[PDB]
From a paper:
The mature protein is comprised of three regions; an ectodomain located in the vesicular lumen, a transmembrane domain anchor that spans the vesicular membrane and, finally, a short cytosolic sequence. Each monomer of the 16-subunit ring possesses an N-terminal MACPF/CDC domain, a central multi-vesicular body of 12 kDa (MVB12)-associated β-prism (MABP) domain and a C-terminal region (termed the L-domain).
Indeed, our (ultimately unsuccessful) attempts to disrupt the interface between the double ring serendipitously led to our identifying the MPEG1 L425K mutation as yielding a greatly improved sample and an improvement in global resolution to 2.4 Å (workflow described in detail in the methods). Within each subunit, both TMH-1 and -2 are folded as small helical bundles. A central feature of the assembly is a 64-stranded β-barrel that represents the top, preformed portion of the future pore. Around the outside of the assembly both the MABP domain and the L-domain also mediate extensive inter-subunit interactions. The L-domain forms substantial inter-subunit interactions in trans with an extraordinary elongated β-hairpin that extends from the MABP domain of the adjacent subunit (the MABP β-hairpin).
Numbering used by the authors:
A (entry chain C): 10 to 176
B (entry chain C): 293 to 526, 535 to 630
C (entry chain D): 177 to 234
D (entry chain CC), E (entry chain B), F (entry chain DD): 585 to 630
G (entry chain D): 60 to 117
H (entry chain D): 293 to 351
I (entry chain D): 535 to 584
J (entry chain B): 10 to 59
Write the structure that this text describes.
């Protein structure tokens, strides 16, 4: 017998879509964390154009969209910062919406060039969006993430508040 | 992250218990944003520009008001563990301006923070017993207990508006894990004596006015997550005086103490990284550890040992050395 | 405990970035930078020009 | 023959109280139980 | 919602004391332990 | 031998009232029933 | 394209950077390691001593 | 290195005993940084310049 | 008490290590200062006892 | 045995039409949501041009 992703790769002989949702995300540093959702490859699903193996709980949207600017865009202050790779998850409506992304390497490199050099920033880009990859709302948690919530769960039972706050 | 901690994702746990997990993670995420927030002046053309600041403070034009540092003092109150540790001796600090737990005549006390400190102490008891002149038994018990103490740290503020001289011309700090930037070390500058505070703060202080004026910085005030400084309104606002810059002192078990200063040495440098969790430590627990040793002083002396109810009978050895460690949570 | 630090260091790497880099490192006399803040942006773009010549021109 | 027999009992009067026991130098550390009941019988010939 | 949470603890202070427990009508009789710690959480909607 | 026998009964007088029960430290959380009827028999030798 | 161990996950970020400029470091106190920068810049007591015995620093 | 010496990584040892191992390694790492710290004058234009110095002494 | 820094103008230089504690002495030659950069002192800094 | 889309792809060797209706649609943001209707591939249907 043979299980997992490699059963899908031998029967279909085509790669796996390497851009997957369901992972953790530090929204101050714009880095991605350990995997929160469960990724299974039981049903050998592919994208509708038939070029990537995808997990079972994930649907893709084909929007093969190319954008080309003949212009630039001017950013003369680091307060209204555009992330250019994680823009939609930083611009959420919350209390700390002004602090999201402010410890990213892409922000801290930009801020130290507008202050050291008294400068303004321009950005030109050619963006090529191919897929939108989403999660089915009936998905379950990962095996590792459930275990660490159950360890917090045990400390709340035993009235151990300082040790649950630590975990 | 706490959106996905709900009774649907966790079907093998009760309803109100996955709402305790969801609330204790929502608090931990919110604590992570608060400890990485630096309000300050963000306009680079203003003279009091705060580099290393994230959030626009809305105070970009100050008035440059010099203030009076009336000193710090800390009370202690032993709660348990008497005649063993004397926690209320190395955790007690008096005001150098009065020699007492009070502010001077031109000042008034402001309560910063009140928490419980814990340390551990240790007993060690041993007794030896011999049976039929062979088979010497020695048990060595070592009990670890937790001694607690309440402390209340206060702080003096110029509230009479007429001082002759301010007093104690310095306002820089260093912790057991921090560094005084006026020395780039965990030490005082030339001719400065430290004043102990919450658990590890040592506030460097000199009232010499001649050898202290080389290193004396303009001081702005202390504030914490519960109290504000009263040097902004003439309760409080816990913002800043205005023109000064917030800088964090240590974290006293989830609460952040901050102090204001207007050097320019504290401000610049490079951009700091994020403070990552955990911001607390796991607490101390009372323990016990025993060591029983059986010594057979002779041959022609057999011994059988059954270690527990699930073990079988076992032929004994001349030296045994059983061990046990007993922990109780709280 | 001190032989553990000889053999295993002071830290454990929890993430690495796999890739490659090509680095130029020049040393210039400190008198050469002291002209102005407009000379600085021409010293700096000269070093990036010399680096692209060195990779391309044999 | 002259003999000796001991019975040590450990009783934990509470939950939220863990215990680890290493029975001898050849045993490994073992998670303890609320009632232990070690036994020993010591015989000397003559 | 209004809630309720109970914690019953049984502590046997002695050896030479056995105990049998039948947890519910579907369970079978079970040999008891020195520390038991049953738990229950009761919720009523409105 | 001296003995002891207990019978705890939980009766939910209503619908719209859920209950979760964890019978011991080795059990998992279990969805409760309207009538429970736990039983216990405690014997001490001498 | 690579065999990885079981306990290790990878993030594909196929990112290329190219500078047309340089960067000036006129003091060895504020040193940038260029290969171990994120593990040296941690917040600690001895953050000023990290990397100061490296061959690239010395 | 002492972050990974905790009761989770070492499940076959008692609780307070893996905190003695974690504290005796935290002390050994901290001792290694202290013996390789050289405070001194770091400004090369000062007449009393301390070559072979890591940390700015402020004097 | 004192500061264990330096007098000022002098340079710290280490004497031997007495079982985990470091004894240092101050001097202003210039011969003690220069040379090459030393390597790191590697552990162990104590010896196993008798 | 073999079920689903891949039974159709092995017998016919031609791709699947990637533009399908029956999904959800946020009409404020013009993004498309989770799938509301049921998509089955039991009858191996193709378009009329094949
Ligand atoms: C080091 O750089 C300085 C610039 O600061 C050079 O000095 C200039 O050299 C040019 C070339 O002949 C002269 O026209 C200028 O008059 C010089 N002075 C200034 C202030 O620009 C210097 O030549 C360089 N060193 C060497 C060895 O070439
Ligand atoms: C949990 O323990 C704390 C410790 O003092 C106590 O105040 C609280 O009432 C306890 N709660 C329960 C439900 O046992």
């Amino acid at each position: 017998d043979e299980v997992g992703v490699q059963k899908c790769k031998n029967a279909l002989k085509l790669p796996v879509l390497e851009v997957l949702p369901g992972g953790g995300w530090d929204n101050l540093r714009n880095v991605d964390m350990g995997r929160v959702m469960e990724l299974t490859y039981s049903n050998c699903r592919t994208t509708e154009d038939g070029q990537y193996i995808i997990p079972d709980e994930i649907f893709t949207i084909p929007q093969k969209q190319s954008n080309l600017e003949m212009n630039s865009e001017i950013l003369e202050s680091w307060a209204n910062y555009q992330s250019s790779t994680s823009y939609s998850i930083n611009t959420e409506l919350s209390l700390f919406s002004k602090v999201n992304g402010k410890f990213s390497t892409e922000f801290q490199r930009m801020k130290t060039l507008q202050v050291k050099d008294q400068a303004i920033t321009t950005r030109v880009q050619v963006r090529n969006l191919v897929y939108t990859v989403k999660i089915n709302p009936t998905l379950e948690l990962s095996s590792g993430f459930r275990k660490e919530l159950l360890d917090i769960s045990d400390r709340l039972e035993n009235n151990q508040t300082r040790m649950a706050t630590y975990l | 992250l706490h959106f996905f901690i709900n009774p649907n994702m966790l079907p093998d746990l009760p309803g109100p218990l996955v709402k305790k997990v969801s609330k204790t993670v929502e608090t931990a995420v919110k604590r992570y944003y608060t400890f990485n927030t630096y309000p300050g002046c963000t306009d680079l053309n203003s003279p009091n520009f705060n580099f290393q600041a994230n959030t626009d403070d809305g105070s970009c034009e100050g008035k440059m008001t010099n203030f009076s540092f009336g000193g710090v003092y800390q009370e202690c109150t032993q709660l348990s563990g008497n005649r063993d540790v004397l926690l209320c001796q190395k955790l007690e600090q008096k005001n150098p301006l009065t020699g007492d737990f009070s502010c001077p005549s031109g000042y008034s006390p402001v309560h910063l923070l009140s928490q419980i400190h814990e340390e551990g102490y240790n007993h060690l008891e041993c007794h030896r017993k011999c049976t039929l002149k062979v088979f010497c038994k020695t048990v060595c018990e070592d009990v670890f207990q937790v001694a607690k103490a309440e402390f209340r740290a206060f702080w003096c503020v110029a509230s009479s508006q007429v001082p002759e001289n301010s007093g104690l011309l310095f306002g820089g700090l260093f912790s057991s894990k921090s560094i005084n930037p006026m020395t780039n070390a965990q030490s005082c500058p030339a001719g400065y004596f430290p004043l102990r505070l919450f658990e590890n703060l040592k506030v460097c202080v000199s009232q010499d006015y001649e050898l202290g004026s080389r290193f004396a910085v303009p001081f702005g005030g202390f504030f914490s997550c519960t109290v504000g400084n009263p040097l902004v309104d003439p309760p409080s606002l816990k913002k800043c005086p205005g023109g000064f810059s917030q800088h964090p002192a240590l974290i006293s078990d989830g609460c952040q103490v901050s102090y204001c200063v207007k050097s320019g040495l504290f401000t610049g440098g490079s951009l700091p990284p994020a403070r990552l969790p955990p911001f607390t430590r796991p607490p101390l627990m009372s323990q016990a550890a025993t060591n029983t040793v059986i010594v057979t002083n002779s041959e022609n002396a057999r011994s059988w040992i059954k270690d527990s109810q699930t073990h079988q009978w076992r032929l004994g050895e001349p030296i045994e050395l059983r061990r046990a460690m007993n922990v109780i949570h709280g | 405990a001190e032989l553990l630090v000889l053999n295993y260091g002071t830290h454990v790497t929890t993430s690495v970035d796999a890739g490659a880099a090509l680095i130029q490192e020049d040393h210039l006399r400190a008198s050469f930078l002291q002209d102005s803040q407009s000379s600085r942006s021409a010293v700096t773009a000269s070093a990036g020009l010399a680096f692209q010549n060195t990779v391309n021109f044999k």
